[PDB]
Point group: C3
């Protein structure tokens, strides 16, 4: 549980090390069941307000079912199509005429029962709401009369809460075309999810992990609507399987590196691209460019490999030797020098240029460091905030070791007269190759 | 209902054809009404818990009205300003002193009634919640006493549900500055919306369409807050009018096209830009660059022309002849060769470069295709998933015809020594013009 | 309250002036308290449905507390870490064993009381929900029996509403890792927030401002979960402090400026970058590049300085003299000429190129202006909508003065043969310097 940060002065970048991986590589699918009541509208002599409250709920219930049935025949398309084929496969099995009865019968005596789908692709089925049993046990005998009979209020509220979960579930499937992510607590109770985690083909270690990061598991799960057939409402919930565990992860931070010439329009800049999370995965490195695809629970990084590029392990060389032959490190160039700061795990990178007031302060002691023009780094030890111009940033107070790797800023190795100063995506090699070829045109002349 | 896909090996792009359009070109505006009760706080001898529950709800009701009245006098600005002038126009008419009474009186006997606004811009008005009638019929006679009289519980809950819809409506207008999109089910019941679709100046064909894509209609509608005046809460709901129907739409997919030289830093790449949806519209083509502005209901593409650029129909030529004189096809160049895949409607494009393990598998049969370095395509027939490195993608299982257009990759037509290898937005012509001009500098020397 | 717009024909950009600032520079922190009941599950002879309804609510209550306690020991990381150190600091103080009792005792007799945290960093503490007092006063004496005693229904519902706020608060902290923004009405009642604004070390002027922009204050606040200890649920709410007030703000709008040659692929374009809001701040200018970081309440611009870059006041010179020596104005070049429009505060910029039908219409009079190829501007006076191709935009109807600054489009000053026509981020100087250096290579030859 030990974090480490290295800051490379030569490239104006920092690496936060010591994290452990939890990369999603597979899916576990479960069928969630809602037993429903098949009742067609029935009109009897009703004036008792209590009977009028049922009529209100009973109609909401009707509309919800029909609205769900209408979402099924409408073939909504989702951007999630690439990630739900394993779950969509289970939905299609449930369509076959045999299969719904096999679930409905397998779940008569319990709330949870393993079921075979005849593939036999075997699922774990859940009954989370039993409105059929409810309506039939306490409601229909009352309103199966020539004149509506008078129920009682406690039964009304017990119904409203039960029905409230239905309506909210339909509302979520409706606005999202039968595919939602994260999986809301209406789709799956925190208790229900923990029960679901306890009955999977994973080690007791993996159960503890998913049980301790319940919130992250939801955010990386999918809920898929299947069918309303034979008094049953079934939807498949797709849960992540983390096949990459305890492999090194590190986060890369970058800031602009510019020369500090006093003259207007005389400065060149470069920045390392591909900031984000890197984790070892199957002899390669999984890179997550997008911010927030990965979730962190202390020391551990939960990511979906679907949001990643695969790079050779040689990519790490860009942090110790950026001019190397093996990997084409990547940079963008410019002449844009605005002061900025990046809050790292254990400190802050500060790129100060021009007349900007860049400083680092301690709440009790005041300013404890003033940054000069250039790219610099400050540990979070004894530091509370960093200020760039009129902007103030809080420094993370996580405990760990910071290592400041001293080195000449590489930007000083370039002749500003021939520098390609507007590259949006260029290797060190492309830039170098490109300067050597432009210097020959001047050589002959 | 027949989809078709063409993959152009020469340009590493694919076109999914056969879709039909439903482009939003106009707006239909309706006034939604909530009859409210004007009651100032009244204190009487009250200890009966039941009377205490009303006091709780009655205060929530008061605060909601005042919070809405305060949102009106505060002149919040929304990014939606460009799209709601037709609805905002109706709100301003309702401000005039005459007009609210004309709605309030026109809706005395019904829940729905067409109204003339004296423009006369004629709207369809809706009463969806009648709290005035309610509070006055069952509540005020009870609490119009020197000592609070004792109501009954069934009336309490009937009030709470009715008031719950109010509070949620105000909450949505509050966090969004009186303009919301989509239109939530609290703003408009699924039943209410279907009733609203049935009373519009559109053909029975257009009614069926909007009735079958209710969820899409919401996501492309706006709800605009107007006034709280004379015991009436009115807001305008803006519904889409699709004036472009049944015109061809196609989606363009692109992937990087690179040379496959074994040498480090010896490879050049290009990619076609402007991936997204194209639909015929009024002799031109409407292009939707942004992902998810358009919504698909099988075979049909629902888009808002407000999120589009207008291009000449000559833009389609970039798919059959990318070097043509008529249209300046567009590409971005680089030397960045990371393996990637794009899931198309009926298959997958795979750009494999370097040491990456790119494959396509069938769930039962295993790997059925291994991709070589370069850009390739695989039909979804007999294919379940595609794998690039450590990343696994599900292939869409939609049925349709795939056509593989064989052709020499255009990247092989360029001399890497003079290639402009860092262009972020360049026509084929700009690149070509630009290579011919750089080859002359070498010609003279 | 007077807005002003200037359109610079020479650069195809417009500036909307006359706005006043309200920039967030500090934070005010308050502790929100929920008194909770410590009751372990108790089983007694219960069949009375009413007693069964408590059991349902009583278990929801239990699960909510444990789910909150589990979020605390799990050390979720949030992207908000940089902005909540002042609030997180208060959470850590509350961890110390002494401190919770000092709050719990300080709030025994009131709902609101100022408290000293022994720093002494003094906070204002709030009790917003008292479930301990409730459960113990009306529930536990009933169910403290050898056989469950029979409660009454009015007490049940009063509990459900009170408990409903708890469950929703936990749900929000759970999905967001104990840090949420905006601060929902479940975290803080509109009444509670206004009460909180009235008890702060700010002038009666600042109170009126925050009280009139309650909705904006929420959207710029944070809610941070602290502890569940000693029958108390405490979370810190972070409220914005606007230290920059009534300083000039202006919004910059830009559109592409292209030549209008009839020949295919003969046209060059440039656009000014850095569109967005600029406000005077401490002798510099705060720039907000991101759309929607800033919120506008009429005439006034609410922004968080955390989302801004700091620029010298010389940046305004890019609107009157874009070739000046003092500031390196910034532009991007291309040969991409698609017609577009930008809706400004008091008008619309229209960049019309090619065969595009660009027009401006009045609802009653029809088309009142047709735009020629080039960049043009139209006031919102007598104008209702602008149309570019198949796209229709509503013009803002705000009242103000528009000034059309005539001038030669700067794009005509460049020789297309040597123009760097694919720059994504380049100063006027870089482009100029760069053309002078490329013209010398032709001079010698």
């Amino acid at each position: 549980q030990n974090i480490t940060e290295e800051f490379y002065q030569s490239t104006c970048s920092a690496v936060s090390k010591g994290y452990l991986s939890a990369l999603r590589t597979g899916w576990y699918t479960s069928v969630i069941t809602i037993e429903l009541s098949n009742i067609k509208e029935n009109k009897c002599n009703g004036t008792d307000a209590k009977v009028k409250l049922i009529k209100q709920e009973l109609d909401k219930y009707k509309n919800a079912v029909t609205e769900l049935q209408l979402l099924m025949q409408s073939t909504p398309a989702t951007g999630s199509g690439s990630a739900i084929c394993s779950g969509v496969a289970v939905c299609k099995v449930l369509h076959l005429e045999g299969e719904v009865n096999k679930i409905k019968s397998a779940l008569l005596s319990t709330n949870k029962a393993v079921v075979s789908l005849s593939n036999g692709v075997s699922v774990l089925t859940f009954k989370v709401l039993d409105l059929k049993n409810y309506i039939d046990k306490q409601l229909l005998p009352i309103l199966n009369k020539q004149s509506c009979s008078i129920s009682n209020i406690e039964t009304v509220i017990e119904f409203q809460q039960k029905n409230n979960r239905l309506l909210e579930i339909t509302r979520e499937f409706s606005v999202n075309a039968g595919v939602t992510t994260p999986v809301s607590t209406y789709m799956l109770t925190n208790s229900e999810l923990l029960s679901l985690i306890n009955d999977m083909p994973i080690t007791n270690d993996q159960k503890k992990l998913m049980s301790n990061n319940v919130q992250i598991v939801r955010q990386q799960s999918y809920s898929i609507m299947c069918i309303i057939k034979e008094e049953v409402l079934a939807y498949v919930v797709q849960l992540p399987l983390y096949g990459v565990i305890d492999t090194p992860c590190w986060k890369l931070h970058t800031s602009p590196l510019c020369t500090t010439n006093t003259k207007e329009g005389s400065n060149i800049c470069l920045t390392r691209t591909d900031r984000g999370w890197y984790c070892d995965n199957a002899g390669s490195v999984s890179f997550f460019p997008q911010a927030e695809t990965c979730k962190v629970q202390s020391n551990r990084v939960f990511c979906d490999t679907m949001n990643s590029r695969t790079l050779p392990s040689e990519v790490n060389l860009c942090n110790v030797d950026i001019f190397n032959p093996k990997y084409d490190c990547k940079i963008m160039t410019s002449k844009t020098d605005v002061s900025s700061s990046v809050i790292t795990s254990l400190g802050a990178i500060v790129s100060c240029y021009g007349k900007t007031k860049c400083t680092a302060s301690n709440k009790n002691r005041g300013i404890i460091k003033t940054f000069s023009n250039g790219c610099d780094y400050v540990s979070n030890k004894g530091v509370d905030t960093v200020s760039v111009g009129n902007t103030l940033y809080c420094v993370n107070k996580q405990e760990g070791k910071s290592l400041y790797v001293k080195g000449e800023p590489i930007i000083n190795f370039y002749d500003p007269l021939v520098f390609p100063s507007d590259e949006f995506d260029a290797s060190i090699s492309q830039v170098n190759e490109k300067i050597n070829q432009s210097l020959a045109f001047i050589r002959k002349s």
